[PDB]
Amino acid sequence: MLVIVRLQDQTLPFELPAGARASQLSNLLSSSGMAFSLHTQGRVLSEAAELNDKMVIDAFVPADGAGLE
Numbered sequence: 835m836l837v838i839v840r841l842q843d844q845t846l847p848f849e850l851p852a853g854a855r856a857s858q859l860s861n862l863l864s865s866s867g868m869a870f871s872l873h874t875q876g877r878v879l880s881e882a883a884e885l886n887d888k889m890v891i892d893a894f895v896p897a898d899g900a901g902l903e
Contacts, residue, residue, distance in 0.1 A: 835887040839863065839872070842895050856883040859891065870895035 837848045837859055850858055856879035860872060871894045873879055879891065 835885075836889065837885075838888070838890040840890065840892050842870075842893070853884060855881070856891075857881045863893070868895075 835850045835852065835854045837850050837854070839846055839848050839859075848859065848862060850862070856872070859879075860881075863869070863872065871878070872891050873894060874885070874889070874891045876892075
């Protein structure tokens with residue numbers, strides 16, 4: 835399945851296995867040096883969350899003071 839991971843202020847697609855889930859995805863991104871939250875549809879993704887192919891995941895990174903606005 836395909837997953838469009840959106841970075842703080844950037845966009846980058848990701849190739850996932852069949853019937854993949856937030857678990858596998860989180861792993862791929864986790865493998866890298868950076869590690870931020872990955873939620874979609876304005877809601878957090880469950881470890882067993884399985885959307886589908888050609889999906890979109892919003893990657894939110896931690897900031898100072900969380901974020902007022």
